[PDB]
Ligand binder design. Structure first.
Ligand SMILES: NS(=O)(=O)c1ccccc1
Ligand SMILES: [Zn+2]
Length: 258
């Protein structure tokens, strides 16, 4: 039937319905820190989330999304490698069944316990559905999670997960501040890539932060209690919802720092 992360419908199968899976600019990738080139002409990132308006949290059967009002310039990303203004639409995570795996990007082949994706679309294209059809349509800010001390700013998300256990459930989720999920440094690597789930469209400028955030064992354990299935269907835990690293091909990863 349809795509997912199991033995019979996982990443190795996606190319049959989505041939772009074997394309020229697929994500995620391994970030080889010694091969990445410092680019002194790259600007500092500008993350402007003070006016962000969260609305809802949704289990979509693949992850959970915290969704934002993107009908005005309320929470925007600019600068760095980007030309123009990109509006925050949603964030979500990918995570593992074990602390030793779960991230999509890797760093010198190292896997982190999870990865946060803050998804933004280029305002010159008018809406998200048009943006994904463009080579410079999206900017995704990727942040690694390691297991250690708790992240206080994540706790409001963890506590609502019981109310969206199964595919298709949603809950009101207002007044959440995504600034509480950011590390101290905004040093980053950047490369042109794709969505990491079907439809795997090649529309993303990836900006991956060098500094991970730490979350507690209890926080990530709660992610692992979510379900891929709908209510009343056989229970399958939502774990290991990550795509592995794809070939770099004809691309260079640039660093904002040395
Ligand atoms: N995982 S990802 O590339 O950030 C992604 C973002 C939006 C839709 C589908 C995938
Ligand atoms: Zn993602």
């Amino acid at each position: 039937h349809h795509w997912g992360y199991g033995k019979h419908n996982g990443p190795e199968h996606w190319h049959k319905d989505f041939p772009i899976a074997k394309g020229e600019r697929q994500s995620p990738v391994d970030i080889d820190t010694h091969t990445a080139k410092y680019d002194p002409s790259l600007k500092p990132l500008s993350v402007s989330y003070d006016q962000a308006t969260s609305l809802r949290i949704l289990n979509n059967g693949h992850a959970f999304n915290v969704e934002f009002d993107d009908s005005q310039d309320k929470a925007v990303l600019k600068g760095g490698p980007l030309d123009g203004t990109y509006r925050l639409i949603q964030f979500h995570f990918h995570w593992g069944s074990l602390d030793g795996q779960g991230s999509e990007h890797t760093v010198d082949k190292k896997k982190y316990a999870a990865e946060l994706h803050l998804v933004h679309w280029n305002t010159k294209y008018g809406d998200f559905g048009k943006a994904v059809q463009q080579p410079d349509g999206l900017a995704v800010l990727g942040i690694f999670l390691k297991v250690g001390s708790a992240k206080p700013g994540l706790q409001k998300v963890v506590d609502v997960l019981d109310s969206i256990k199964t595919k298709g459930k949603s809950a009101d989720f207002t007044n959440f501040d995504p600034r509480g999920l950011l590390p101290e440094s905004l040093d980053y690597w950047t490369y042109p890539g794709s969505l990491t789930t079907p439809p795997l469209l090649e529309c993303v400028t990836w900006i991956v932060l060098k500094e991970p955030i730490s979350v507690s064992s209890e926080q990530v354990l709660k992610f692992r209690k979510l379900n891929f299935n709908g209510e009343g269907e056989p229970e399958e835990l939502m774990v290991d919802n990550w795509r592995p690293a794809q070939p770099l091909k004809n691309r260079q990863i640039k660093a904002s720092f040395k």
